[PDB]
Design a protein around this ligand. Structure first.
Ligand SMILES: CCCCCCCCCCCCCCCCCC(=O)OC[C@H](COP(=O)([O-])OCC(O)COP(=O)([O-])OC[C@@H](COC(=O)CCCCCCCCCCCCCCCCC)OC(=O)CCCCCCCCCCCCCCCCC)OC(=O)CCCCCCCCCCCCCCCCC
Ligand SMILES: CCCCCCCCCCCCCCCCCC(=O)OC[C@H](COP(=O)([O-])OCC[N+](C)(C)C)OC(=O)CCCCCCCCCCCCCCCCC
Ligand SMILES: CCCCCCCCCCCCCCCCCC(=O)OC[C@H](COP(=O)([O-])OCC[N+](C)(C)C)OC(=O)CCCCCCCCCCCCCCCCC
Ligand SMILES: CCCCCCCCCCCCCCCCCC(=O)OC[C@H](COP(=O)([O-])OCC[N+](C)(C)C)OC(=O)CCCCCCCCCCCCCCCCC
Ligand SMILES: NC(=O)C1=CN([C@@H]2O[C@H](COP(=O)(O)OP(=O)(O)OC[C@H]3O[C@@H](n4cnc5c(N)ncnc54)[C@H](OP(=O)(O)O)[C@@H]3O)[C@@H](O)[C@H]2O)C=CC1
Ligand SMILES: CCCCCCCCCCC[C@H](O)CC(=O)SCCNC(=O)CCNC(=O)[C@H](O)C(C)(C)COP(=O)(O)O
Ligand code: SF4
Ligand code: SF4
Ligand code: SF4
Ligand SMILES: [Zn+2]
Lengths: 115, 145, 155, 176, 209, 55, 54, 42, 342, 96, 45, 108, 107
């Protein structure tokens, strides 16, 4: 039948726990991340750039997808603990140099055939 | 006896290389004092030598010219003054000089072989080789109808 | 004449520069092993007056040889910026020149020039040991053709 | 069948053991490498004098592309696009147009070396031997835009490099 | 073969591998589904996903099989199936100089028990497969990216993943270190739909449908 | 291709007859002016009885 | 013909050399089981005494 | 069908958040399918 | 519009924006970031240079192939500018030196060269021109710098009635020689300041704000004729400037009161140096004199540009000058100086 | 033979010429738009037309194997002169 | 004409050696030692 | 590193100089070779294998060639196989030459 | 090469003279030989190890999946096991005794 085998999160509750200790590791990670990683951004914008990515994926109802994502969350997390990534690697989360993307209909009409 | 034999070989070397001036010329520019048979001499002044007795890869060699197309090269040189007819002989792609059998001469081949024009104003530039594809509707010349 | 004097000191500077420049012991892919092919006694890297030093604080000309990847990119720019001036860069092979055989690949940056300034683009895939050994020669000629302290005098 | 490589138990004989002891105390096998290295020093070096001297090559060498032409003067290319279809890195871009006369060759023939692989596949893919891998390995340059040629320079390259390949395909036309 | 063009055959081996194909079938009827030896003497065992670790254990352990070498790990992706990724193993038996192929199927979400315990060679082959295809396996020691770029999002070998990728990078002087941006090629991949419109092999043709 | 005295020195320091054959190449190589070849036809180049269905 | 006289040149330089040997012998060892368990092949197995060659 | 702590997650599969194609290329891309038509001269 | 000029692509490296840039003297701080943004969105940039091509190579990895073309050029020779600005759409003037050299005087690079670049560009027929003049450009100012900007601005205004003159207040950034100036001051013992620098308020602006404002002015169809003044977001006293930047460097600040004439003398000995001077008498007046406010002149926000605070971007420069004892220290540890903003 | 565009730059064999209002021409400044002097348009017209006496002729392009693949062109149209598409040189009947 | 390609000589190429040909050089350990003291004892005299 | 044998990130967690952990971060050279393999034809796919390992030029496509024609139920002519094994052994010499000497290079 | 011209290009002399050679050469150098569907794991004795390819053909003129077996991949995987108790100079010895090449170990 349509019933499926979960890996770690049987339902939303345990999955909601797993996204919580991601915050638990991340929140105490951002301060010394900036400290160790020679970053010039402050902790304040470091904290909420972890925030909005939770709402970047705050629509999935399938527990497996949350579980499939919880592994990657600690993967990028662990990649930051032992300085494996470089400055540009974490800067890629900080969208900083690209041109702003148009939003209103007048802007994309004035830009080109982009729908 | 063989010791003084190589000493006179050096004494032959200075004598055969146009005396002292030529030997000091090749020693300080050609970086080598070896003497080889005059296999050929192209139209650009590049002097070529051949020594079959030496080990492979050091049998055929080139003394570059001091002038090419107003690009004085007495001191500086590069591996591109070699004309197309002789460039195969230098790299021993063949055991024939162009003098023995010249290549088939045709109309369109260059008369003056050139070198890397990079850096010089004669350098190449990429450009479109295609015509315009969508030409616009020309506005009417007449004023308001 | 002042210009005569500056030209003479100019001639002293580049001659030492082009005679004693030190390529980096940097190698990535197929081009790297052919780069050490000419360093073998057949073509004699050293007889042209150059020796291989390792760290950025050590060498003169970066010799980029191999495919450039996204993961390789941060270190290459870091190691290139870490070389004291004057510093030069030559780009071995089609792959490092730009894109290469993997130009369309997801994990290859299309051009080492997209990351680091380049003096000479030595082509071939792999470039024959003869071709790049000229590329060093062209850089010697390019180093010869400068007016660093001469442009300063007229600056 | 196999050959055992590393086991030879040394004899414990007085003569043999004092051999190893003499080898240990008096560096003997150690100076053997030192001593032979002297013999190899007196060998004359196998170094060519570049660019005054250039290494050996073969007629079937792959270098810079050069579009050739018929003895009359008409360029061999007839826009079959087989070179484009085979080019493993899509370094060839081809556009064609029937212009006026028996000379519709290319609107565009751009070979992208920094994309090209120098496999030579275009050379034997050509039914008319138009595009060839020239014998010139020496075409380096300082700008990235240089390392690509247009259709015109391919013609100029075939014009400038003409005697070498004409003789090279002359010697190699039976092998391939 | 009196004709020197076509490749010969080793019917003795073909039947011999087929005999061992049915051999495993009775041994583990729960896990194998169908066992097929190809025309060119390659006998493949097709096992169920959940029974991945036992069959590999059986081939490593059993005297009559003694397959102890993890040659390669592949998970060939076919979009037309419900669980697309079919994970294919590769084993070599030194004592019987023969190769076996055991394979399963697994969608993007179903986890597989990692075979690192049964084959230490699976370890790094495991770090690569999750990178390229994106199929997570369970209880792996240090399952983590070992092929793609640090923080590179998306499994590049997936069918939905374009060959050109999604992002490209370039050094920027205003920030004095390299930075990424959406991919915008100088030359796009000119697709070459060169597949012949005429049937090439009557033997392998699917039944009418 | 050197003096006899050093040839003894090289032959004795290395303890082997290097002069019989050396690393560098000499005129024992084949000349690079080969006569034109006459490459053979294949087994299926038979003018008759060469139907593709049989091969 | 000339090459066989050159591996002996390398082997004279290295194999009998104690300096090469000390840095090399017994530095990095694999047992029989973990050799083919780790997926090694070619020289890695052959050095470990595994009787296998493709 | 294989009872291993099975839960009835029958909602439509949404792997987009995991495959993570960019927002412009997941919404603003009309994906269309057909059977290709045979080339007429063929 | 020109047939092969319509903008194309999604503003990338290989895209087409329709801007044939002709930035002059791009081998500088303003030029480095200006060509960066022009190259980033995708636009043909023609960069004339006078110095060694080696120094100009750091602008090579700044755009797609064949988008940046380096051209030799000379200020005195009229034909040199003509070649550079012939195939052009926008010619922006970024030439000018903070000190005086024997061949080129202050008026030469700030009036004579802008006079030539404006006349040739108009004669050639480029649609737009942007000129850079100091926001404190004043004909009666004690510094020959600001006087030269004022008359130079007047000349390019008359020669080019549609030129968009840019008025940056006090640029700062990595190689900015403005805060690098005070940062390098710790080498000479204490920190010499005229009357302790308590009577000078400046409003610095960081590079990207003026840089982005340049192309925004290029893209703006109504920017012609205007005299946009690019000014920072906050005003601080001169003492507050040195107080803050030394704190971010954690170097021991040693205030040192100076008479005006002694500081004027100090510039004289440091101007003797045949190499690049460190301190000039003109620089003495510029740092002493205070930034002025011109509300009537349009600012930088009108072009959709937000002035980045100095404290936010000061760390990007101060990290290099700070010692190892505080190299990894963050920016929240330091506290922005007392703002005396309008 | 190479012509010259009104802007003073030589035209290529395909007829491409950069417009005077064009901006991308500046790549030619301090450089050259070199053009192959041997125009294929003018490199085949002056070649003589042969007068073979046969209905159908195999054109090889010269050199045997080195030439283009053999093509059997036809000479029956009296008003038109036969030619091989591979090479472009002319063929003609013996005045019939 | 008969078919000609690159072929081995009619008798075939010469015998290619592959084994070790390492020389046995030097002198006996006793002789090397006896020399060592022999010159050594000369030294103290 | 010159002892890196090219490019890789080998992080050692070591005390003194006894290596405790030697995690070999690989992929610094990564080209999606198998991905571009998917879009090229078999003939266009041949040069890919020639560039897998820089030590054995035609040992690689020998495996790739054996992959295709053996799947194709086609065999090469007997003379061709002798050329393949002859050059494969020459290719075997090619790797072993710097499999040992570059070993000695990092060794000293 | 195999006399079957459908898998190997015909000779140049025949390609310029005979129809079948030319038309095959045109289509072989524009489509490629059609490989039947299937999978194979041919592996040869590479100078390092057992370099092989898991070629998987869908039946068209282009391969579907081709995974490269790299002997270095396993050898570099075991590098952690080899280096244990040895020093930093020894691990320099080990990574050369497996002859790791990073276009192959990495693919
Ligand atoms: C102990 C060293 C003693 C001095 C050098 C003797 C030497 O090696 O002479 C070469 C000579 C022959 O060497 P070779 O490699 O057989 O020559 C082969 C060709 O004939 C070589 O053909 P070639 O064309 O090279 O012959 C000419 C060559 C011949 O060169 C020589 O003979 C070298 C001596 C200078 C002349 O001279 C040159 O090439 C000119 C350039 C010379 C460069 C400067 C040499 C300075 C030597 C020292 C000067 C004093 C300080 O060496 C010997 O015979 C060995 C004698 C050892 C005596 C030891 C006494 C204690
Ligand atoms: C503290 C500062 C102290 C300063 C002291 C003042 C003098 C310092 C420098 C002295 C040497 C200057 C350099 C001379 C060589 C040079 O640059 O040559 C350029 C050029 C290089 O020319 P090139 O560039 O054509 O060379 C390379 C290209 N090929 C190989 C093709 C030729 O050479 C010459 O000018 C030729 C003459 C050189 C003569 C040198 C001296 C020879 C005798 C030495 C005897 C022993 C001395 C000890
Ligand atoms: C013993 C050595 C004897 C010869 C020494 C000659 C002088 C070399 C000094 C180092 C290079 C700089 C130089 O020559 O002039 C400095 C001059 C300094 O003035 P500059 O303005 O030319 O510096 C380069 C340009 N900027 C300042 C933008 C980086 O620089 C150059 O000449 C380099 C061009
Ligand atoms: C120009 C310069 C010419 C002079 C050069 C002198 C030094 C080099 C001489 C040749 C090399 C030595 C010999 C060699 O390599 O092989 C022969 C042999 C090789 O010996 P072996 O390693 O085969 O062992 C010999 C012993 N049996 C036969 C029993 C196994 O050299 C020797 O035996 C010499 C030993 C040298 C010991 C060095 C330390 C003591 C030196 C004297 C006191 C100080
Ligand atoms: N606070 C400030 O510094 C302010 C500065 N400005 C002006 O804005 C511009 C910013 O310049 P920036 O990018 O920082 O560069 P720099 O001031 O550091 O250097 C001068 C720039 O112009 C070029 N240049 C200098 N002298 C000449 C000359 N005689 N002829 C031609 N070109 C010359 C230089 O390149 P090269 O040396 O190779 O010729 C370089 O690009 C300058 O004109 C500056 O005075 C405006 C407002 C405030
Ligand atoms: C710069 C530093 C390094 C780089 C740092 C940035 C990179 C790493 C980011 C790591 C975090 C990751 O993106 C998101 C995750 O972990 S999980 C999302 C789960 N999404 C759902 O399950 C859908 C429904 N979501 C909700 O209902 C609520 O919004 C939620 C549960 C999220 C919280 O609210 P409440 O608990 O319900
Ligand atoms: S250009 Fe060719 S040889 Fe060089 S790294 Fe790329 S594929 Fe290898
Ligand atoms: S060798 Fe020829 S066919 Fe192959 S990529 Fe280069 S140009 Fe194209
Ligand atoms: S170069 Fe040859 S293969 Fe390519 S289009 Fe021209 S004729 Fe055809
Ligand atoms: Zn014809």
């Amino acid at each position: 039948g349509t019933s499926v085998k979960p890996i770690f999160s049987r339902d939303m509750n345990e999955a909601k726990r797993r996204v919580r200790e991601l915050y638990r590791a991340w929140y105490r990670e951002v301060p010394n991340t900036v400290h160790l990683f020679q970053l010039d951004i402050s902790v304040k914008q470091g904290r909420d750039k972890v925030r909005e990515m939770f709402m970047k994926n705050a629509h999935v109802t399938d527990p497996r997808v949350v579980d499939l994502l919880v592994i990657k969350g600690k993967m990028e997390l662990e990649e930051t603990i032992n300085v494996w990534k470089q400055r540009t690697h974490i800067m890629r989360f900080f969208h900083e140099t690209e041109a702003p993307r148009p939003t209103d209909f007048l802007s994309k009409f004035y830009v080109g055939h982009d729908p | 006896m063989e010791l003084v034999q190589v000493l006179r070989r050096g004494l032959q070397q200075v004598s055969g290389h146009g005396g002292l001036r030529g030997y000091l010329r090749v020693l300080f520019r050609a970086n080598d004092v070896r003497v080889g048979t005059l296999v050929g001499e192209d139209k650009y002044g590049n002097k070529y030598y051949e020594d079959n007795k030496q080990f492979f890869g050091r049998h055929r060699w080139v003394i570059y010219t001091t002038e090419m197309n107003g690009r004085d090269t007495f001191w500086d040189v590069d591996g591109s003054m070699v004309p197309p007819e002789w460039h195969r002989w230098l790299h021993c792609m063949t055991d024939d000089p162009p003098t023995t059998k010249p290549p088939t001469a045709r109309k369109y081949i260059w008369t003056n072989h050139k070198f890397n024009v990079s850096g010089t104003p004669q350098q190449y530039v990429p450009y479109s080789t295609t015509r315009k594809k969508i030409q616009e509707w020309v506005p009417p010349s007449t004023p308001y109808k | 004449r002042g210009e005569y004097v500056v030209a003479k000191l100019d001639d002293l500077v580049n001659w030492a520069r082009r005679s004693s420049l030190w390529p980096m012991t940097f190698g990535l892919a197929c081009c790297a092993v052919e780069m050490m092919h000419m360093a073998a006694p057949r073509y004699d890297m050293d007889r042209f007056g150059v020796v291989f030093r390792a760290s950025p604080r050590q060498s003169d000309v970066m010799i980029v040889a191999g495919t450039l990847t996204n993961k390789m990119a941060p270190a290459l720019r870091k190691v290139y910026d870490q070389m004291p001036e004057p510093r030069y860069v030559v780009s071995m092979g089609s792959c490092a020149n730009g894109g290469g055989y993997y130009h369309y690949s997801y994990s290859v940056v299309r051009g080492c020039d997209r990351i680091v300034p380049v003096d000479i683009y030595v082509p071939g895939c792999p470039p024959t040991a003869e071709a790049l050994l000229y590329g060093i020669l062209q850089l010697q000629r390019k180093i010869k053709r400068e007016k660093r302290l001469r442009i300063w005098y007229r600056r | 069948t196999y050959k055992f490589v590393n086991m030879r138990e040394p004899s414990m004989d007085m003569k043999s053991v004092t051999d190893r002891a003499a080898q240990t105390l008096l560096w003997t096998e150690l100076v053997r490498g030192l001593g032979m290295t002297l013999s190899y020093l007196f060998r004359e070096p196998a170094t060519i004098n570049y660019p005054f001297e250039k290494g050996p090559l073969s007629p079937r060498f792959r270098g810079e592309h050069a579009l050739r032409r018929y003895p009359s003067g008409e360029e061999r290319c007839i826009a079959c696009k087989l070179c484009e279809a085979v080019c493993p890195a899509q370094a060839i871009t081809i556009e064609a147009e029937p212009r006026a006369d028996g000379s519709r060759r290319t609107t565009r023939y751009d070979i992208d070396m920094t994309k090209c692989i120098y496999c030579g596949f275009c050379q034997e893919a050509c039914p008319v031997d138009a595009i060839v891998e020239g014998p010139n390995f020496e075409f380096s340059t300082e700008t990235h835009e240089e390392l690509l040629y247009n259709k015109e320079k391919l013609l100029n390259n075939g014009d400038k490099w003409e005697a070498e390949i004409a003789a090279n395909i002359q010697a190699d036309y039976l092998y391939r | 073969d009196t004709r020197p063009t076509i490749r010969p055959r080793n019917d003795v081996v073909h039947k011999q591998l087929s005999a061992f194909g049915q051999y495993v079938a009775e041994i583990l009827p729960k896990y194998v589904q169908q066992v097929q030896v190809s025309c060119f003497n390659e006998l493949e065992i097709f096992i169920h996903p959940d029974g991945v670790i036992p069959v590999l254990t059986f081939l490593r352990d059993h005297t009559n099989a003694q397959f102890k070498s993890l040659a390669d790990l592949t998970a060939v992706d076919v979009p037309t199936r419900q669980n697309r990724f079919e994970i294919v193993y590769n084993l070599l038996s030194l004592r019987f100089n023969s190769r076996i192929r055991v394979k399963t199927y697994t969608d993007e979400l179903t986890p597989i028990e990692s075979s690192v315990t049964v084959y230490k060679a699976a370890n790094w082959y495991e770090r690569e497969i999750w990178d390229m295809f994106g199929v997570f396996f369970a209880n792996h020691p240090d399952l983590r990216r070992i092929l793609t770029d640090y923080g590179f999002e998306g499994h590049p070998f997936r069918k939905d993943f374009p060959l050109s990728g999604y992002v490209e990078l370039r050094y920027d002087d205003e920030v004095k270190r390299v930075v990424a941006e959406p991919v915008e090629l100088a030359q796009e991949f000119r697709k070459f739909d060169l597949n012949s419109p005429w049937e090439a092999f009557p033997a392998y043709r699917q039944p009418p449908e | 291709s050197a003096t006899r005295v050093i040839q003894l020195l090289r032959n004795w320091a290395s303890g082997r007859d290097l002069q019989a054959k050396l690393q560098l190449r000499y005129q024992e190589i084949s000349k690079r002016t080969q006569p034109p070849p006459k490459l053979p036809v294949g087994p299926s180049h038979k003018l008759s009885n060469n139907y593709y269905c049989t091969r | 013909k000339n090459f066989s006289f050159r591996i002996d040149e390398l082997e004279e330089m290295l194999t009998n050399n104690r300096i090469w040997r000390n840095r090399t012998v017994d530095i990095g060892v694999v047992t029989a089981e973990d050799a083919l368990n780790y997926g090694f092949s070619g020289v890695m197995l052959r050095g470990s005494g595994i009787q296998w060659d493709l | 069908t294989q009872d291993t702590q099975l839960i009835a997650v029958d909602e439509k599969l949404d792997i987009t958040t995991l495959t993570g194609v960019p927002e412009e290329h997941i919404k603003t891309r009309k994906v269309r399918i057909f059977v290709p038509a045979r080339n007429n001269m063929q | 519009l020109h047939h092969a000029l319509i903008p194309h692509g999604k503003g990338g490296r290989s895209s087409v924006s329709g801007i044939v840039a002709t930035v002059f003297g791009a081998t500088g701080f303003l030029g480095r970031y200006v060509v960066n943004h022009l190259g980033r969105m995708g636009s043909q940039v023609i960069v004339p240079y006078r110095c060694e091509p080696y120094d100009t190579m750091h602008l090579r990895p700044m755009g797609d192939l064949g988008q940046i073309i380096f051209m030799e050029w000379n200020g005195k020779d009229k034909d040199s500018i003509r070649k550079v600005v012939e195939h052009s759409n926008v010619v922006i003037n970024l030439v000018g030196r903070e000190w005086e050299t024997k061949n080129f005087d202050f008026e030469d690079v700030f009036v004579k060269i802008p006079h030539a670049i404006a006349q040739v560009s108009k004669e050639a027929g480029v649609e737009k021109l942007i000129h850079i003049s100091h926001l404190n450009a004043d004909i009666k100012s004690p510094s020959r710098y600001l006087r030269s900007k004022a008359v130079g601005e007047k000349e390019v205004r008359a020669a080019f009635p549609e030129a968009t003159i840019i008025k940056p207040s006090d640029i700062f950034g990595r190689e900015d020689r403005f805060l690098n100036y005070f940062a390098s001051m710790r080498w000479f013992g204490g920190v010499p300041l005229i009357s302790l620098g308590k009577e000078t308020v400046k409003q610095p602006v960081y590079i990207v704000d003026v840089s982005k404002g340049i192309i925004n002015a290029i893209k703006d169809p109504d920017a012609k004729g205007k005299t946009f003044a690019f000014v920072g977001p906050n005003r601080y006293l001169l003492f507050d400037l040195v107080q803050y930047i030394f704190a971010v460097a954690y170097r021991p600040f040693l205030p040192y009161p100076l008479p005006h004439f002694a500081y004027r003398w100090v510039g004289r000995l440091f101007e003797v140096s045949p190499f690049e001077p460190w301190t000039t008498r003109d620089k003495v007046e510029r740092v002493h004199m205070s930034d002025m406010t011109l509300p009537h002149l349009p600012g930088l926000e009108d072009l959709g540009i937000q002035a980045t605070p100095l404290e936010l971007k000061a760390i990007e420069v101060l990290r290099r000058h700070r010692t190892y004892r505080w190299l990894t220290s963050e920016m929240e540890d330091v506290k922005p100086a007392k703002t005396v903003n309008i | 033979g190479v012509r010259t565009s009104p802007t003073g730059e030589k035209v290529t064999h395909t007829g491409q010429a950069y417009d005077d209002g064009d901006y991308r021409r500046v790549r030619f400044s301090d450089r050259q738009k070199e053009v192959n002097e041997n125009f294929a348009i003018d490199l085949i017209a002056e070649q003589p037309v042969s007068e073979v006496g046969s209905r159908v002729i195999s054109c090889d392009g010269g050199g045997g194997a080195l030439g283009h693949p053999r093509v059997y062109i036809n000479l029956d149209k009296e008003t038109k002169t036969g030619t091989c598409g591979y090479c472009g040189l002319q063929f003609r009947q013996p005045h019939h | 004409s008969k078919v000609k390609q690159d072929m081995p000589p009619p008798g075939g190429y010469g015998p290619i050696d592959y084994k070790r040909n390492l020389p046995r050089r030097g002198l006996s350990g006793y002789s090397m030692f006896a020399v060592g003291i022999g010159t050594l004892l000369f030294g103290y005299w | 590193h010159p002892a890196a044998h090219g490019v890789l990130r080998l992080v050692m967690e070591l005390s003194g100089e006894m290596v405790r952990k030697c995690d070999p971060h690989i992929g610094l050279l990564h080209r999606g070779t198998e991905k571009l393999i998917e879009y090229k034809t078999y003939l266009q796919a041949l040069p890919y294998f020639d560039r897998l390992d820089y030590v054995s030029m035609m040992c690689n496509e020998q495996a790739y060639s054996l992959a295709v024609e053996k799947l194709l139920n086609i065999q090469p002519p007997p003379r061709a196989q002798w050329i393949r094994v002859l050059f494969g052994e020459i290719t075997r010499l090619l790797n072993h030459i710097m499999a040992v000497t570059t070993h000695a290079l990092d060794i000293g | 090469k195999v006399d079957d011209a459908k898998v190997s290009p015909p000779k140049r002399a025949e390609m310029k003279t005979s129809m079948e050679s030319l038309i095959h050469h045109f289509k072989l150098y524009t489509e490629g030989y059609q490989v039947p569907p299937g999978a194979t794991y041919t592996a040869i004795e590479a100078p390092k190890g057992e370099f092989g390819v898991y070629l998987v053909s869908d039946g068209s003129s282009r391969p579907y999946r081709c995974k490269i077996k790299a002997p270095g991949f396993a050898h570099l995987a075991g590098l952690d096991k080899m280096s244990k108790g040895h020093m930093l100079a020894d691990v320099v010895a080990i990574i050369g005794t497996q002859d790791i090449v990073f276009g192959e170990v990495d693919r």
